[PDB]
Design an enzyme around this catalytic site. Sequence first.
Site, PDB file in Angstrom:
ATOM      1  N   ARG A 171       0.807  -1.220   0.000  1.00  0.00           N
ATOM      2  CA  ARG A 171       0.000   0.000   0.000  1.00  0.00           C
ATOM      3  C   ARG A 171       0.841   1.272   0.000  1.00  0.00           C
ATOM      4  NH1 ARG A 171      -3.396  -2.717   4.235  1.00  0.00           N
ATOM      5  NH2 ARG A 171      -5.225  -3.656   3.210  1.00  0.00           N
ATOM      6  N   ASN A 206      -1.780  -5.460  -2.931  1.00  0.00           N
ATOM      7  CA  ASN A 206      -2.939  -5.041  -2.152  1.00  0.00           C
ATOM      8  C   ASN A 206      -3.440  -3.715  -2.708  1.00  0.00           C
ATOM      9  OD1 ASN A 206      -4.852  -4.723   0.167  1.00  0.00           O
ATOM     10  ND2 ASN A 206      -3.572  -6.322   1.097  1.00  0.00           N
ATOM     11  N   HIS A 213      -8.928  -7.960  -1.607  1.00  0.00           N
ATOM     12  CA  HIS A 213      -7.733  -7.116  -1.688  1.00  0.00           C
ATOM     13  C   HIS A 213      -7.033  -7.273  -3.034  1.00  0.00           C
ATOM     14  CE1 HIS A 213      -7.903  -5.999   2.589  1.00  0.00           C
ATOM     15  NE2 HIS A 213      -8.253  -7.254   2.807  1.00  0.00           N
ATOM     16  N   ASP A 235      -7.910 -13.254   2.954  1.00  0.00           N
ATOM     17  CA  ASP A 235      -8.577 -12.541   4.034  1.00  0.00           C
ATOM     18  C   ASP A 235      -9.703 -11.668   3.490  1.00  0.00           C
ATOM     19  OD1 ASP A 235      -6.478 -11.020   2.816  1.00  0.00           O
ATOM     20  OD2 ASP A 235      -6.813  -9.441   4.308  1.00  0.00           O
ATOM     21  N   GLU A 236     -10.721 -11.467   4.323  1.00  0.00           N
ATOM     22  CA  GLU A 236     -11.704 -10.396   4.139  1.00  0.00           C
ATOM     23  C   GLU A 236     -12.347 -10.418   2.749  1.00  0.00           C
ATOM     24  OE1 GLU A 236      -9.369  -6.959   5.333  1.00  0.00           O
ATOM     25  OE2 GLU A 236     -10.268  -7.051   7.335  1.00  0.00           O
ATOM     26  N   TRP A 240      -5.359 -14.180  12.686  1.00  0.00           N
ATOM     27  CA  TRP A 240      -5.268 -12.732  12.827  1.00  0.00           C
ATOM     28  C   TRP A 240      -6.487 -12.120  13.501  1.00  0.00           C
ATOM     29  CZ3 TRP A 240      -8.227  -8.716  10.845  1.00  0.00           C
ATOM     30  CH2 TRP A 240      -9.231  -9.080   9.940  1.00  0.00           C
ATOM     31  N   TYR A 268      -0.997  -5.994  15.900  1.00  0.00           N
ATOM     32  CA  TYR A 268      -1.116  -5.168  14.705  1.00  0.00           C
ATOM     33  C   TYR A 268      -0.676  -3.736  14.977  1.00  0.00           C
ATOM     34  CZ  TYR A 268      -3.578  -8.252  11.405  1.00  0.00           C
ATOM     35  OH  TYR A 268      -3.906  -9.220  10.492  1.00  0.00           O
ATOM     36  N   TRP A 319       0.632  -2.630   9.051  1.00  0.00           N
ATOM     37  CA  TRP A 319      -0.354  -2.456   7.991  1.00  0.00           C
ATOM     38  C   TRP A 319      -0.440  -0.975   7.655  1.00  0.00           C
ATOM     39  CZ3 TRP A 319      -2.116  -6.347   5.258  1.00  0.00           C
ATOM     40  CH2 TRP A 319      -2.233  -7.615   5.833  1.00  0.00           C
ATOM     41  N   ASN A 320      -0.240  -0.635   6.392  1.00  0.00           N
ATOM     42  CA  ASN A 320      -0.189   0.768   6.002  1.00  0.00           C
ATOM     43  C   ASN A 320      -1.556   1.217   5.482  1.00  0.00           C
ATOM     44  OD1 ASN A 320       2.629   1.712   6.510  1.00  0.00           O
ATOM     45  ND2 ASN A 320       3.090  -0.132   5.320  1.00  0.00           N
ATOM     46  N   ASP A 321      -2.511   1.284   6.421  1.00  0.00           N
ATOM     47  CA  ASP A 321      -3.882   1.642   6.051  1.00  0.00           C
ATOM     48  C   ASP A 321      -3.979   3.080   5.558  1.00  0.00           C
ATOM     49  OD1 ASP A 321      -4.208  -0.828   7.261  1.00  0.00           O
ATOM     50  OD2 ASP A 321      -5.895  -0.190   8.513  1.00  0.00           O
TER      51      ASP A 321
HETATM   52  C1  NAG Z   1      -5.606 -10.041   7.357  1.00  0.00           C
HETATM   53  C2  NAG Z   1      -5.773  -8.585   7.686  1.00  0.00           C
HETATM   54  O1  NAG Z   1      -5.178  -8.059   8.619  1.00  0.00           O
HETATM   55  N1  NAG Z   1      -6.618  -7.904   6.902  1.00  0.00           N
HETATM   56  C3  NAG Z   1      -6.903  -6.481   7.022  1.00  0.00           C
HETATM   57  C4  NAG Z   1      -5.716  -5.650   6.554  1.00  0.00           C
HETATM   58  O2  NAG Z   1      -5.750  -5.600   5.131  1.00  0.00           O
HETATM   59  C5  NAG Z   1      -5.762  -4.269   7.185  1.00  0.00           C
HETATM   60  O3  NAG Z   1      -4.816  -3.390   6.581  1.00  0.00           O
HETATM   61  C6  NAG Z   1      -5.406  -4.484   8.642  1.00  0.00           C
HETATM   62  C7  NAG Z   1      -5.418  -3.234   9.499  1.00  0.00           C
HETATM   63  O4  NAG Z   1      -6.621  -2.489   9.385  1.00  0.00           O
HETATM   64  O5  NAG Z   1      -6.293  -5.443   9.243  1.00  0.00           O
HETATM   65  C8  NAG Z   1      -7.407  -6.061   8.449  1.00  0.00           C
HETATM   66  O6  NAG Z   1      -8.502  -5.212   8.362  1.00  0.00           O
END
Ligand code: NAG
Length: 734
Positions: free
Chosen positions: A221, A250, A322, A390-391, A442, A468, A514-516
């Site tokens: 990301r 992603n 994703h 995931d998701e 996770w 996380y 995680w680089n949200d």
């Molecule tokens: C397997 C996983 O962690 N999936 C998502 C990830 O894509 C997201 O960036 C992170 C932090 O918000 O956690 C979840 O929502």
Amino acid sequence: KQIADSLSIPPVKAGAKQLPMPSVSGAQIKLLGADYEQLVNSKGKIAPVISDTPVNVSFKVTKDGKEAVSKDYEIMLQAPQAAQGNPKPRIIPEILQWKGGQGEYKLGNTVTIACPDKELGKLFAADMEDVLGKKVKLVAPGAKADISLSLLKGGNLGREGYRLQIARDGVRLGAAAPTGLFWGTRTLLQMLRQTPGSVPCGTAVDFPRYQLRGFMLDVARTPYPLSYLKDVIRTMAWYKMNDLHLVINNNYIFHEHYVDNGHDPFKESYAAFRLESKMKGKDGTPLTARDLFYTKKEFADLVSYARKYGVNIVPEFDTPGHALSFTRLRPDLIYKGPMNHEKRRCEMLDAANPETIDLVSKVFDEYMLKDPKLGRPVFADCGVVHVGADEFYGDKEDYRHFANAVLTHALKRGYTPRIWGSLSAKPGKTPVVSKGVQMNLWSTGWMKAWEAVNQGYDVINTNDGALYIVPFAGYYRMDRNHKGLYNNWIPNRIGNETLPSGHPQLLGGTFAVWNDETDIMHTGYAPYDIWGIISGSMDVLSQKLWGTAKAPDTFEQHRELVSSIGNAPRTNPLHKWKDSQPLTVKPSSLPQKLDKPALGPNYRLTMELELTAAPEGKEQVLLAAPEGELLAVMKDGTVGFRRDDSLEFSFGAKLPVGKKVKVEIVGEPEKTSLLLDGEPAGTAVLKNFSDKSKDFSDKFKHRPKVHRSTFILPLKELGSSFQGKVFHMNVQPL
Ligand SMILES: CC(=O)N[C@@H]1[C@@H](O)[C@H](O)[C@@H](CO)O[C@H]1O
Ligand SMILES: [Cl-]
Ligand SMILES: [Cl-]
Ligand SMILES: [Cl-]
Ligand SMILES: [Mg+2]
Ligand SMILES: [Mg+2]
């Protein structure tokens, strides 16, 4: 089941060689496992210890035809009596066993090393030279040497264990395998960082409680250069961590931001696939990311390099969620069924469609099968490949069909697949293969630990609530809980569930960055800006992954020790200079070679220059190095810079043409400032993504709250493409 629930494990006789099995007439009881398999094997044989060591054991009970596993029972293995001698050296992670000796071994002005592995020998010697400032030489195996490494036959050390014995006639590092030798070198180097002149006599025996001690980095990301990944590798190895999971593709999470502000996320959302690939979409657009990517040769060499350091790299291709990088290739394969989070539909692949598994398997095969240029698969040295999964918010049975298919494809290709645990939130009757599959636990809501174990998966503690990190966000802030993790976190407690620590299906654990808050949310944070939180997480979690269930010291003492031990050898993650001496250059002609190391904050760069021509839309590079470029004139005419993560920043000010001017650039963590003739000209602002949201109203609430703009100062070449004169240049570390 009631039996295991209420089993009673008595104390172990001091020095006993066999664990007494509990006895209940109604059922059969056998060892489920010990957290240190090295100390108590599956049959109950107890290995000797050289200092008292705790071991957690657990049991499987079979009554009638029903099975059940007990909780952990801690037993204490006792060493024979001794004179104790020197105290145990303080290492991160802690040395498991130590019997102190008498006196010290004093290092000479030169140091010799005997090593049967040539590659390990060269690496160890260069690390030693960096740590000691002395000359180190490799001699023949079996020859007289100050430090002698050897492979031991038999024993309980396993692949990663080592025995380090220090005596007046030198240091002997033995291991069952070269990986244990490497970990032993890490221990010795951490010792020498504290006292480089001599090391205490005595014997250490050391091995990990968990075999998977991991870090996951979202390199999709927002981009990370190979140099940063190599820093990560060396620092992981410095703390004996060994599993680096890299998210190769992603996309931006919050497609709803575009939808709700009148834009199509399928056209607008940031997405990236970070490997060089032959794949191109219908419209002709490549799969491989444009801003930054790793060539196939670069990635294979990165995997081999990490292997040198005892670290396994695990690449992840994330489908069927994703997967905007894939749907952009094949928009006809977008999922059309019902789903939660409907505004994120654009990233969802049509899981049930045979053409979807065809596309995904073809992409995987580009790296799993032999590459014609390399003569071997790009992933030839990746034993594990992560298939994501995931998701996916669509149909459960479609998801299970696809997940089974991608896992089965990886297994058929001879790879071990790893997957995001999703089967509690996506239950169903479609079988999903489990034999040979690793799984990141996770989210408890997506996959219960005990359900995963009972379904047959090898599990990795990856629990979001504890492990996380989303940089600079309002959630998932494990970086703020390092003391609590140090004092309390154990690999076998996974959210609100606890497995026995010796469960054979528990591989260990992984923390994740995680680089949200990227794309249109991106504040401009750099890899440099998260180094402290990454390294800090390592220096805590390494202890709990390699070591026992109890921390050896207080958190404060731990961090004091972290500071005393320092960064990994030959690793300079904050880009500091050896001494704070300034650099002054009177340039004779441009371009001018500087050949100085890049400089991280804090610094002040002062230049007396004159821009003599500024042809429209033409970039002018004033300073350059692999770490980045200072642009006197950008395409929009402003002063700015570009970093080695491809992010570009502008100060919002322009240099005058045909006029002498004093340029000052002040670099601080997360802020680079420009002054012209002593007047504040501006602070740098990230430019890469803001144009997409420029016309959003204030109903959009997710602009970058702070404008971060770290700049590692590049100092390899001056005036690469500067159309002007530089009369004076001074670089001052602050
Ligand atoms: C397997 C996983 O962690 N999936 C998502 C990830 O894509 C997201 O960036 C992170 C932090 O918000 O956690 C979840 O929502
Ligand atoms: Cl005991
Ligand atoms: Cl918080
Ligand atoms: Cl950086
Ligand atoms: Mg760097
Ligand atoms: Mg185990």
